[PDB]
Amino acid sequence: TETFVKDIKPGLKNLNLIFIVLETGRVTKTKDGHEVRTCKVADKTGSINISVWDDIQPGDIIRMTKGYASVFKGCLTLYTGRGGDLQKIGEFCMVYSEVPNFS
Amino acid sequence: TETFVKDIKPGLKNLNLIFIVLETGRVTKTKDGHEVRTCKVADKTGSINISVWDDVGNLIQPGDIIRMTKGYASVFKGCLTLYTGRGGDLQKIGEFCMVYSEVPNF
């Protein structure tokens, strides 16, 4: 019961999803203590941003459970609300191969 | 019965050795549809060219390690290019790579 990026626009609520992590923004420590991280991830179907409480790094492949979407006005964003549960299921990275130098 | 890149003479036969792909370049194509790949290979005794048959481009890589058997030589366009014999072969038997992983930025 998964879904895709550009399909989803503000509203929309319950949403399970796998994706890769492109970029990661700038921290804000709410005075009450929590890590609210906003971040840049997507599937191949375009792009989107997300907000995280007290946890990810680019290059990661994330499974999202029971997350939901609505907009912080600058384009809709994704939450982890009902309980929410983001899991990592694999990696991805850029790789460079060359023949050693000789002799 | 093996011989080094260094101890190689044009007009030689029974060519059984092992070497590694240094660079691939010079793609030239027949109108059978096939293509012949000019590669630079070597051993610890020196470097040398080769003209290879393979209709698929991107699969012959720097790092590849191949076992030449009963192949042969003749100069081509002034440069010495190596060929396989009509009863020997070429097997890829391993690899050797400067590998390097990361995640980019945007």
Task: Note the maximum CA span of chain A.
Answer: 62
Q: Which residues contact B81 (CB under 8 A, 6 or more apart)?
A: B38, B49, B50, B51, B73, B74, B75
Report the candidate in A36, A41, A63 with the shortest Cα–Cα distance to residue A52: A36
CA–CA separation, A98 and B16 (whole Å): 26
CB contact under 8 A, A93 and B101: yes
Alpha-carbon radius of gyration of chain B: 15
- Among chain B residues, the shortest Cα distance to A103 is held by B44
Q: What is the resolution of this structure in A?
A: 3.0
* Integer CA distances (angstroms), B91 to A24, B42, B54, in order: 46, 15, 13
Residue A11's CB is within 10 A of a number of other CB atoms, namely: 10
CB contact under 8 A, B22 and A100: no
- Residue B21 burial by Cβ neighbours in a 10 Å radius (0-12, 13-18, 19+): buried
Q: How far is B26 from chain A (nearest CA, A)?
A: 18
Q: Which chain A residue has the Cα nearest residue B46?
A: A103
Residue with tokens 């680019």: A58
CA B28 to chain A, closest CA, distance in angstroms equals: 23
CA max distance for chain B? 55
Chain A contacts to B (CB-CB under 8 A):
22-23, 40, 57-59, 92-100, 102-103
CA distance B53 to B81: 13
Give the number of other CB atoms < 10 A from CB of residue A97.
14
